[PDB]
Each structure stands twice: as C-alpha cells, then as structure tokens.
Symmetry: D2
Subunit: 422 residues, 4 copies
C-alpha cells in the first residue's frame, strides 16, 4: 500500500515519458504540502476570524500590497495577522508560524521612489520578514532597497519582482544580490508579449532552483475564484504546473484580497500543490540538481547533500535540522528531497522566513533550555519528532535523518545521523 | 553556412542543452519562433463563428478543425454550419499560399448505459455529410468505441474516432479505450466534475503521455482561454495552460465557448496560435526523441523503420521539412509520433486524409489533384516537387535547404520504405 | 523467435545501465553476427608460402602487413606476389572472394628528425607495387604525415596513411596528427619503452576513443597473443587484451611475431577471430550509439545524413545487414563510424577501395567485376543483388531478414543520399 | 565548468589536472576516454589489493619484508603443493616479516593470510585432504579460504562445516573454475563472502575466448552485491622469467581494475618466478593508474540506482558518506569498525576517497584488504573510561595516521563514520571534519 501512494510507481520510472504514463488519479498524496501559499491581505481577508480560517486552510505568508491603503491600514492588517497567528500558540507542538511580506508600490515613472523609502522604513519598524521589491531592473535597484531598510532591517529577506524585459535580461545580476525572485506575471504580461511569459517563468524558476534561492509564482493563478466558488480547468493546471516547474511559493492576489471565496482559494491551492508535489519526477530532478550543484568545501553544503541522499536511500519520513538563521534548512531544500525538512529553530523570524523554501516545515522551539549543550540539541531533535508525530509527518518505525552541528552558533552544521522513530 | 543568427532562434541553445534543468535555464524570450505552428487548433462552431466571413477570418487566424457540438442545435443547423465551413475553405482554392484544408469534427451529445438513439442518428448524419472525425462523448470502455464504430455504417469506416475521456471509469479503463480508438480527447470540463478538480492535471498528463507512447493523436480541451469569452486578452493562467498542454505533448488544442459564443472568436484562435508556436520551440527534443526511440518497440514494419530513420536524418542536418507521400495519412502519422522539429509536409491525393492529418502534430497537408502520370516514378517525382514548390511558396523552404523525402517502392498504401536526403534547387 | 533474443548477448544489449549490461553477459549466448574487427597479419618466414597464405585468408586475415624494418625490396616484392597469388586463387567464385589489403609498415626515422632516405625509397617501392596502406612509423607531428604524403607522390594519392603513435610527442600532438592522417595505429611496443609501461593502456584507450569520435580507423598492435609465437594456446592475459581492445573500440587488431615468425600463424589468426566475435557481441550498443550520435556534429553532407538515418533504421528492425554501394569506401566508412550491430556489406568495383575498407570496423567488402549495365538503375540493382547473394552464401543473410540498402542519386563518388528498407526473398 | 569553478579557484588547476580528474568529470563515457591523459599523475593511495602466492621465490623473511614494502596485502598459501610443515613455516615467516614493522603503530601494515585449497579432484564434493587442510587453517589462524572448484551452494556449506565452530570468522572466497560454477553463480555468491575468477581452470573448462565474459559478468555481479571479487591467473605470466611484462599483461591488470575487481593476484610470478618483488611493484603501479581512470561519475550513479532501498542505518550512512566525500573531494573517509562491515559498505559505492578503517580486531584489519579502497589501521590502545572519548581517540588516531602516511594534509576535508553505541552493527553517523 505504501508503494501505491504519493505517485511512487511514477517516481520509480526509468524515463520521463514512463513517469507521465504511470501518473495515477487514485494514488493519494501522503506527504505534507511543501509549496508555501502567499495570500494577499485585503477587505476580504482582514478580520481576525477570517485570518484564523486562512491559517487553517494553509496560508503561510501574508502579503501586504502597499500599492493600496495607508500605513494605518497596513499596521492594523499586521496586528490582525499576529493576533490570529498567536491564537494557536497555546499548543506549541502544532503552532504554525506565518510570515509577513511587504509588497512595494514601485518606482512608477522614476529608481527607488520616496513612497517606497517610507514604506520600507514602516516595514522595518513593524518587523516585517520579507520585502517583495516591485519592478527590479538591475542589481543597483536591490542595493537601494537594502539601503532603505537600514541597519535595523538587515535580516529582512529581499525577493526581487521581475516585471519587465530589462529585469528578465539582467536576471543573473539581480538574482546574485537578491534573496529570491518573484515572477510577477501581471506586469510581465503587459511589458513583454503575453505568449512569452511562460518562457520567462520556466527560465527564472530553473535558474533559481540552480542557485538554491526561493522563487515565487504570482498573479491570476485562480483569478475566476474572485467571483466563482470553483476555478477553471486552466487555473488548476497553472497552479499544478508552477509547482512542477519548481516554484517554492505560489501566490493569491485579488482571490484573497477582495474576492468572495478567500478561504476556498487557499484550500484549492493547497489541494493542487499537494497533488503536484507527489507528481514531481524526483529520479531525474535529484540527479540533475545533484550534478549541477557545484563541488564545495563548506561543511553545511557537504552535509546537506549527504543527508538528502541518505533520506532517499531509506524513504525517510523527514529530515530534522537545527537551524539558527534557516540556512541549513535552505541547503537541504535546494536538493528537493521527498522527505519533509523539519526545521527546529529558536528564532521566530527565521521560522517565518523559511516558508520561502519549498519543503521546509518550521517549528518554533519554546521549551525550557538544558544546561548541557549536547542535551539541549538532543531535546530539540526529540521536539521535532514529537511535533512530527502529532502533525502526521512521522510514525513509530519510520526512519529520519537528523542534521546538527559540532558547536553552538550559526554556520557549524556538519553532522548527519540516521534515527529510527521510537 | 547557416549563420550564428540561425542558432539563436527557435530556442536552439535550450534545445542543445545536456540536462532538462539547463534546457529551462537557456529558454529565451528574445529567441523568436521560426517554424510553422505544428499543434492544430480546433474551434467550436456556434453563433459567434458561423458566418462565412467570420469563418474566413478564423481560417486565416489558424483554425484547422471545425468542431460541431451536437449537444445543441438541430441537424438543419449543423448542415448549414458544414456548408459555411466548406464555402469559407473553398474561397481560398485560388491562392495556393492561402488555401488550407479544414477538417470537420462531430462532437456527440453523449449517453443511458451505452449508445443513445440521438447519437446513432447524429453519427448517421455525420457519415451522410462526410465528416472527418467523431469526438465520442463519455467513452468509458472499449465496447463504447465499438458501438460508435458500428454506427459509422457501411460508408463511414474511414472516419476517425477520438474518444473523449470524461469520468473516473474512462481514466481507469484508458488502455483498453486507446487500443480501439484513433485518438483521445482530455475532456476537462466533465472530468473536473466527475473526479476532484485538483486531480485533472494528473489525468491530462498521463493520457497525453500514453497517447504519445502509442503514436495516437491527443486533444487537450475546455476552458483553455475561458476569460476570452468576454475579455480581449486572456489571464496569465490561461496562456500558461495552453503552453503547458503543448509541452505535455498534445497534438491538438481546443476552443469551445471562446469561439462558439464569445465576443472574441478570432482573437482566441490567434492567441492559441501565438502560444503554441512559442511552446513548440521550447520542447526539449534531445530527451524527448531519445525516450520516444527507447520506448517505441522494435519493428519489422518498413513504414515504422523508415519513419525513425527519416526523423533521425532530419535532426542531423536541421532539415527544413520532411516531405512524405501518403494516401491514408499513416506514413505522416508515423513520422509525427517521433516529434521531429522539421515540418512534415504530407502530399496526398485524398481530400479526407488531408483534413484528418491535422490530428497529428506537425503534419502540414497538401492536397494534390493533378492527373496521374502513366509512368509511376514520374508521378512520384511530380508529387515530391509539388511539396517542394508549395514549401518554397509558404516559407518552409529555400534553395540550398536540405529536406528529407519519404516514399515507397510501389504504388498503393502500406509500402513506405525509402528515405532520401535532397538539396533544394 | 525466442532463441533469436537469447543469442549475440541481446539480453545484455537491452540493459538500462552498463552495470546491468555486465551482469547479463552470458557465456552460453552464442555470437551470430560476422566478425567485424579486421585482423592484420604481419608477413614473414612463417607466412610467406602461397599455401600457408590461403589458410590464413580462410582463418580471417584481412590485411597483410609488410614490415620494412626487415628484408630487402626483393624480399617484399616476393611477399606481395605470394599474397596476391593466394588472394586471387579464390577469384573464380566471386560470391565468396575475400579481398585482402597490403600495408607497408615503414622502418622509421631512427635518430633523424623526420623522413629518412630509406623511408623515401620504401614509400616509392610501395607506390610502384600498388600497396593500399602505409603504417608510418614514429609519427610525432602533422608535418611527418605531410612528408610521407609527399614521398608517395602524385601516383600514390589514393594510398591510406595510418600514423603510428609510438612516443610521448605523438601522444601529446595526437589531435594534429589525426586531423591529417587517415587513421592511427597504437604501436604499443615502442610506446611501452618511450613512456612508462603502466601508462600505455591510458594512451590506447584515449586514442581509440578520439578515433571513434573522429570516425577514423584505429589499430591496436603488439604482443596481443605473444605466447602463441611458440605455444598453441594463448595466456589468460592475452585473450583478455584482444577482447578489451575490441571493447575499447579498435577497428583492427594486429599480429606481429605471431604470424611473421611463429609456429602457429594460422591458429593465432583463428584465435583473434574467435575472441573478436565474442567481444563485438558484448559491446553495449545502447550507450555507445547514444554517445556517438550526440558527439557527432550536425552535418549538411547527404552521405553523412543518410548514414545516421540508415544506422538508426538498422537498429529499429534488427537488420541483418546494411548493403552500401561505394566507389571510394567513404559511404561505408560513414556507416561504420556509428557502430551498427548490422554488418555493413560494401559493394564496389574498385579493387583498392575493397581492400582499404577493411580498416573500418564492420565493413565487409565485395568486389563487383561485371561491366556496367546500359541502364544505371539496373546496374545499381544488380550490385545490390550481388550483395544479397554473397551475403546469403556467406551466412550473413537468410530469406525473411530485413536489410537497409544505401545508394546515391547519380553515378560517381560523393552522391549517396538514399536509404531503403528491403525484405530478403 | 560552473560546477567545479569555485573548487578549482580554491584547490588550484594543478589539483584538477592530476588523478584523471578531467576524464572523471566528463559527461559521457566516450568523452571520459578522450580525456584520459598519460601526463595526469595518480595521487591517491593504491586501493586494489595485491595477493601474492608464497613459494620458494618468496618464502624468506627478508624477501617477504621487501614484498610487504612493494605492496603485498594478502599472502596466498597454495595447498596444491607442499606439506602442512612447509605451510606452517610460510605462515611463521609471513608473521615475522609483518611484525618487524609493528614498532611504529602509525605506519604498521597488516597482511592477510589466505589458504587456497587443493580441490575436489575427480570427487563430487569436499575431499578428505581439503578437510584436513581446512582444519590446519583454523588451527594456524588463517584469515581467508580460497575454496577451489565451487560448483553450487552446498560446496561452500561443506567448506564452512569443515572449518567448524572455531573458524566462524574466516572469510570464504569461492573460486569459480568451470561451467557449472558460472551457471550457478548467484546461489554460490549468496552464501560466499566473495568470489575468485580462477581463469586458469576456467579457460580449460570453457572456451578460452569466453573467459572475459565470465570475468566481467562475475565482477559486475559482485560489485552489485557489494562482495569482494578477485581476478586471478597469468596476469603478469611472462614476469616468471622476464624482468618486464608484455603489453597484453599490463593491459590485463589495468582492465581487471577497470572491470571492478577488489583484488588482483600473482601466482607463479611470486611463488616460483625470478622476479617476485618486481611483479608486485608492477601490479601496484598499474592498479594506481587504472583506479584513477575509473569513470566514477557513471559508476556511482549506477551503483546508487542499482542498490535497493535500505532501512539498515549502516547502509544509509555509507551512501550519505560517499556522496559527501565526492561533493568536497574528501581526502579520506575515516570509519570505526569491529568486523570490517561498515568499511565494506562504504567500499561498495567505490568512493575516490580512501576508506581509513580503524579497528581493534587484528583479524578484521587483515580481512578488510579484500575490499577495494579500505586502508586498515590496527588500534592497540586500551579503552578509555568514557566511551565517547574512546571513539574520539580512535578518530584522532586515524587523522594522525592519515597525516603521517600522506593521505591527509592540513586544510583537507575528511568524512568520519561512527555509531551511536558500542558493538558491531550500530553505525549511523556521518561527520564533515576540516583537518587542522
Ligand atoms: O542553519 P544555521 O543558521 O547555520 O544554524 C545551524 C546551527 O545550529 C546548531 O545545530 C545548534 O546551535 P545553537 O545551539 O546555537 O542553536 C549549530 O550546531 C549549527 O551551527
Ligand atoms: O501512408 P500510406 O497510406 O501508407 O501511403 C504511402 C504510399 O504512398 C506512396 O509513397 C505513393 O503511392 P501512390 O503512388 O499509390 O500514391 C507508396 O509507395 C506508399 O506505400
Ligand atoms: O561512397 P562513395 O565513394 O561516395 O560512392 C558512393 C556512390 O556509389 C553509387 O551508389 C553508385 O555509383 P556508381 O554507379 O558510379 O558505382 C553513387 O550513387 C554514389 O555516389
Ligand atoms: O562495522 P561494524 O562491525 O558494524 O562496527 C561498527 C561499530 O563500531 C563503533 O563505531 C564503535 O564501537 P566499539 O566501541 O565497540 O569499538 C560502533 O558504534 C559501531 O556499531
Ligand atoms: O521532473 S524532471 O526530471 C523533468 C524531466 C523532463 C521533462 O520534460 C520535464 O517536464 C520534467 C525535472 C524538472 C525540473 C527540473 O529543473 C529538472 O532538473 C528536472
Ligand atoms: O559500451 S559503452 O557504452 C561503455 C559504457 C561504460 C563503460 O564503463 C564502458 O566500459 C563501456 C561505450 C560508450 C562509448 C564508447 O566510445 C565506448 O567505447 C564504449
Ligand atoms: O505586482 C505584481 O505582483 C504583478 O504585477 O504581477
Ligand atoms: O465535452 C467536453 O468537451 C468536456 O466535458 O470538457
Ligand atoms: O612498430 C610497432 O608495431 C610497435 O612499436 O609496436
Ligand atoms: O586454481 C586457480 O587459481 C586457477 O585455475 O586459476
Ligand atoms: K505592490
Ligand atoms: K457534445
Ligand atoms: K616497421
Ligand atoms: K590450489
Ligand atoms: Mg506589479
Ligand atoms: Mg463533455
Ligand atoms: Mg615501432
Ligand atoms: Mg583451480
């Protein structure tokens, strides 16, 4: 029964053609949904009660669109998101962190506009986790956003939105200085011929997967759900294909900001992403990612490849990793393991930000500290296992891969262990 | 010899990539498509696309197959639609550069446990009016296809039966249905109601893959550009859906309400044409050909053996086209199953085969009406030169180009066994 | 039949990985194909008798090597006369006649920087006596090949020059030497003294790989069955060395003392024949063909395009042979470079080309002696029928087999452009 | 180039020109052959073990010391010749020569002793002389038995029974010498510790032109099973009377290594020939060149794909460690092992990194020579009170010995493989350590 679920016959296929032939509508997804859902906050999704339903439906990142509304309006949205998120903190083994992303208005006819400088300062003051920088055309646009965030906003992730021909052409220099990319198909589809957007999307997703940096697919993914309870056949296909392309995140704009079915739009993206993740041809994907990732003398990078290889060998239910900044989890995620990457962290910001990386499930550690560092590490590992058991990721008898470091502090991951559950 | 500009167009850098990941990384929005659009467009005929003048614009925009939806309208209404399609098609018989055969497909109302009384009557109407294809609704098992085949009476055995897979049973019994059908339609509308909507993409990709493996045509249908029923431009999900259906391996893409009742029927056809052209150049032929080659069983059929040799030869020299002489369309279909980048120009004396080969990706039919030569080898040479001259006229070919020519050793269907490399003069 | 798929290591040939290919190799799977790697036998006191040469031709000797390091011009002229007498003793049966090439192996430069005066005289002797091939000793750079070509003069333009790589400089300047040579000999004797003995296998494997990539013949030479100079059976290392040279991709394997001075020249030829046959069936064609196709550059030459189409067609149908008409041997060489499992039966009127194509693996030359038919198409057909009848007599073909036939559109060399699938009747 | 650019800038272009690294990074096997370079020097320690047959030409203690220095890893006693008294003296001389280097534990090289049986002769199974010789082997503490003419699984069970309860730790390597052994190979391999391709008798029992097929098939199946395979007979035959081998002989040795053989053997070349030390030196030189010419890119991919999914933590850790070693061009993989099993599971994936196996078992240290690329280090120190400290001391012993023997330099990355509790069977940890 195990080998009939999660498209495992299609996953073992010798060719991509045979993989397609073996895809089965009766093969149920079992793994937790890996691709994060970004929901745009607006009148249809601003109330605390509505936000609680969206968190339960699968929203991982709340997007604030600074193209509309005042700073007072957005501060209220942030407070409501935090209130809804913290209403589940009473049960630490099931608490789900939710990131807050600020999407800038953009340069308009102008580099960095004066309104963007003020909005970015607002983001730092209100503790946003991510900035979706509009109309990034070159590396200096990213540097300007980074400078406007100042010394207090050093830890904020900058996701550059590629929205025009210049951004596509200067993609490599933009990705090099950004934390990730958003394929902003709305403006891109007006700036370049609409029939060419899929080429830009597939290229950018492929280059971000190669670089090991997050990539978001955005705009009109479930557009008809703004007024209708069910999406069109092209919309479900678009969501599934963005996941199959390799997108780390998928986004909802008007569907959640102003539509009549915000919760249903989140549920639909969750349902499709789960089905599409199981249909990924891991046999070829892992081989190509493994071959393309350069040789490295960084122990975190070396441990990450060893751990993902070990996870595939034993059909590991999860890879439990201890991380301070999220980096060790990101390096595991870049190899696209089928095993869930359970990231145990003390940082609340890193727990929110790792939603940008596909297949990373953040667990915010709030248990009493241990006096012995080795005992403290072992307790965080057992915490990952208990949360994993409660959430359905793990069962007794499963094998897990555990990734830790040799000393406290970020940058010292160098150990991989094979552990049998219970 | 060809120029550096030649190797920058039609995603040739992405086509030469060593891995699928590198192929994606090399896709370029500035790399323009050059080849003719190979995925056929099926447009549903209705009030918005029934007039002769509107049909002429749709033919110019790229419509290859006219679909008659027998779920609505009387036999009198459909006979008028057929006459208007034929009038619009024949209005271009004067210009070889603009003339294009257009197939007529009858889409049945559907079942009841099996073939309904109305379907028997509608299928008889199709035979009497000379339709080329039947899109059989709600096919669930092999016996449903046999019933449709039996209903195509004594005169309609040459009509192609494309089984529409619309429910869980059709998906589960797919292999037995494909074995007896000429092709398949992934009817996503009903399929998305019969099975969970989030599972339709799995059924679509599986069926397209199995049809590509079998070498049989597969159509992707329903809501591909739905928003264009009221809006002049489609959504980002809709263009993505069309491009991904072509990348999946679909031979045909379809328009329903977009062309039958919408406000922008011609623009919907133009949009599918534009997207299919871009998506066909983005196909990763290096891995696709290797896998089709490996999956296709060994064969002692000379048409099958010649077809793979010809497609291999076309890739080796970047041939502008493969010109094939075919009476039934079968030799062109066997070339099409290996997905060559070269256009397959099919020269036939059969007007029905010329219309039906639109079901096969990359087949460009040319109907030949010259009187037969007394010396058979001369008749063959005249048809090969007709394909070359039409190719030059239409932009497929130029003097100095290499073309692959596929012919047989004797007259009659079933004897294809020759592949030649010709330099265009 | 099921028995067909158990022979010639067909289970190992269909394997998905090289490891699984090795695991499926079967000592009970009998070779069926004709032996495709040519055997070069060096002539000497043990192999000069006309009666002894007839037995060596029957055992499988394809090329007779004259070592100009020993003997005078008078000695070599007698060797040539004896070889020709033994070869021509079988000309009374044209369907079974086996051409045998004559190769002149030069003494070398010695302490000199380039072409020695003795080599100039020996090369002129070769042209005057009609030798087919020159094995040029100690080639260190492209100008050494040009000097050999100049010494052959205008009358020796058709002689093939195979450069012997015997030292570090020849290995380092390999690419420039191969570019101007017709082929290469891995002369392991001197190479093993000039460079550390433990590194010779790396030079052998590299040169064979680069010659296979270039589509040019490569010979493996020296001490392959050394112990057979005095013993009736070779050592385990010797049979392994012959099998591995064939698996590496060598077009030819050579015997020196084993045939020139030993006590078992006929048995040494028979042993190389037996081993080469076993090793050719053990070649992993699935990966080899894929890599040769991918590495071979795109081409606009119709002979090159037809060759890859014909090899692909031959693999698709398990063709027993590819029958090719050739004037210079070039069309057969271009088929051979893709390493088909099907025998390449080359029909030619040129006695020299028939002898020289033994340099290319899997090419079986048939010398056609009949004067041309008045109708060129009938002369082409008669030559193809001669290939089929010789093939049937020699066991290459049976009724019911499929064969690929490679011809051109006009008389004269350079116009091959047609591939046809033919059933043997 | 993008996949190796940063590491090329860090380690230098000279590093990437050595040990056939350009040929190792090739995208196809054809390109791998085209990139093989006679100027690309081998750097890694020789990983294929050399088995030398002991006889009159290689019996003296002083001669044996030269053969150990030349590279002999396993001493073979051919029980087809000589009495029990003769073989006991050979064993004592081998042990005396081996122990003459024990004064320096950081450089001491263990040498295994293998007993090669006379065989069944005309009989259907285990002969009475073989039963007596096998009992002699157990009494004299031999490490390995090369069982002659194994034709079926019951032949190896008979050898195992003749070894008795005291010989349970002895490795049984079945010699495949006839058609029946080749045809029943899978059942023989399943119950054996490894295989020997005995080409001498095999070449008489089956047509000589078919021996290479049997050799390549058996080596491939042993590599797939992760069990040692020995290539034997006439590898450097001419060196019995001549100082240099023929071109076919060097080719045969190189091709046995490229085929995937864990061990290569010398028979008459060492036992009775005129150049025993030179024959060992020649096999050493060729094996080093051939190991660097192995196409690891395809080999690792195929071993990974063919090896079934596993829930055994030693197996899971082994593939993770070999993958990690390739990622960083690790100089070595240091593994703690009691029976040799954790080192054998690393060896089956054919890493380019040397597998330095630290063990307290003198027998396991000798027996791991059967596995390609395993360098045994015998740890003689008594256990620390705290088990975690005892583990760390053993790892440090491997690093210090690795530095001493030239395997490791400061700045190198090393992969360390250990377990969560004492005793055999609990390996489950992989660590990436930077050498300081
Ligand atoms: O992913 P990051 O940011 O490098 O953090 C990984 C770090 O986490 C640890 O596993 C635990 O460290 P702390 O005890 O400081 O939380 C370290 O050993 C390791 O260096
Ligand atoms: O594709 P089909 O229907 O098999 O037709 C292919 C046939 O066309 C030809 O090339 C030309 O035949 P006709 O002259 O009868 O049209 C035949 O030699 C070949 O058998
Ligand atoms: O292999 P080559 O030397 O190019 O010769 C091939 C030539 O042989 C032919 O098949 C037959 O030519 P001939 O009639 O002159 O022998 C030509 O059509 C073709 O050009
Ligand atoms: O390779 P083997 O025979 O399984 O031995 C590996 C064992 O060695 C160790 O690393 C150390 O164990 P010891 O302390 O008993 O020597 C164990 O943790 C592990 O189980
Ligand atoms: O799943 S894959 O192996 C694959 C292969 C061939 C195809 O045509 C295809 O659509 C998908 C894959 C996907 C994304 C990658 O970036 C990659 O490296 C591999
Ligand atoms: O037969 S092969 O596919 C092969 C693959 C892997 C091996 O390790 C091997 O020894 C042989 C091959 C491929 C290309 C060649 O140019 C060749 O000579 C052989
Ligand atoms: O701003 C965006 O997200 C867009 O334009 O697609
Ligand atoms: O009938 C159709 O086309 C459907 O259901 O999608
Ligand atoms: O000349 C030769 O043949 C050699 O050196 O091997
Ligand atoms: O017994 C042996 O070692 C042989 O036959 O090779
Ligand atoms: K915005
Ligand atoms: K209908
Ligand atoms: K010579
Ligand atoms: K013995
Ligand atoms: Mg925008
Ligand atoms: Mg329907
Ligand atoms: Mg020489
Ligand atoms: Mg024996």
């Amino acid at each position: 029964a195990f080998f009939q679920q999660q498209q495992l016959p299609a996953a073992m296929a010798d060719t991509f053609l045979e993989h397609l032939c073996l895809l089965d509508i009766d093969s149920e997804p079992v793994a937790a949904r890996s691709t994060s859902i970004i929901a745009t906050i607006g009148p249809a999704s601003r109330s605390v009660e509505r936000l609680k339903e969206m968190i339960k439906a699968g929203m991982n990142i709340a997007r604030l669109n600074f193209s509309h509304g005042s700073h007072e309006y957005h501060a209220e949205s942030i407070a409501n998101v935090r209130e809804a998120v913290e209403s589940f903190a009473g049960s630490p083994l099931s608490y789900r962190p939710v990131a807050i992303a600020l999407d800038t208005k953009g340069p308009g006819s102008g580099g960095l506009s004066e309104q963007d400088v003020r909005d970015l300062r607002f983001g730092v003051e209100h503790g946003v986790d991510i900035v979706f920088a509009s109309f990034v055309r070159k590396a200096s646009d990213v540097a300007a956003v980074r400078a406007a965030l100042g010394p207090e906003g050093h830890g904020i992730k900058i996701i550059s939105k590629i929205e025009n021909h210049e951004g596509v052409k200067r993609f490599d220099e933009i990705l090099e200085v950004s934390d990730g990319i958003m394929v902003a198909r709305g403006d891109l589809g007006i700036e370049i011929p609409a029939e060419k957007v899929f080429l830009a999307q597939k290229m950018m997703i492929g280059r971000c997967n190669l670089a090991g940096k997050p990539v978001v697919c955005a705009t009109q993914m479930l557009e008809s759900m703004i007024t209708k309870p069910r999406p069109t056949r092209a919309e479900t296909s678009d969501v599934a294909n963005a996941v199959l392309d390799g997108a780390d995140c998928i986004m909802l704009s008007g569907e959640t900001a102003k539509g009549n079915f915000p919760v249903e739009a989140v549920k639909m993206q969750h349902a499709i992403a789960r089905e599409a993740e199981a249909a990924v041809y891991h046999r070829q994907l892992f081989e190509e990612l493994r071959r393309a990732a350069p040789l490295s003398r960084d122990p975190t990078e070396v441990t990450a490849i060893g751990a993902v290889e070990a996870a595939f060998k034993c059909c590991a239910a999860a890879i439990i990793v201890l991380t301070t900044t999220g980096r060790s989890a990101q390096l595991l995620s870049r190899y696209r393991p089928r095993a869930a990457v359970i990231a145990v962290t003390r940082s609340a910001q890193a727990a929110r930000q790792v939603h940008l990386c596909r297949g990373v499930f953040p667990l915010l550690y709030r248990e009493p500290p241990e006096a012995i560092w080795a005992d403290d590490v072992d307790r965080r590992v057992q915490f990952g296992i208990e949360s994993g058991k409660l959430r359905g990721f793990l069962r007794v008898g499963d094998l897990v891969i555990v990734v830790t470091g040799w000393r406290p502090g970020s940058g010292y991951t160098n150990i991989m262990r094979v552990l049998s559950i219970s």
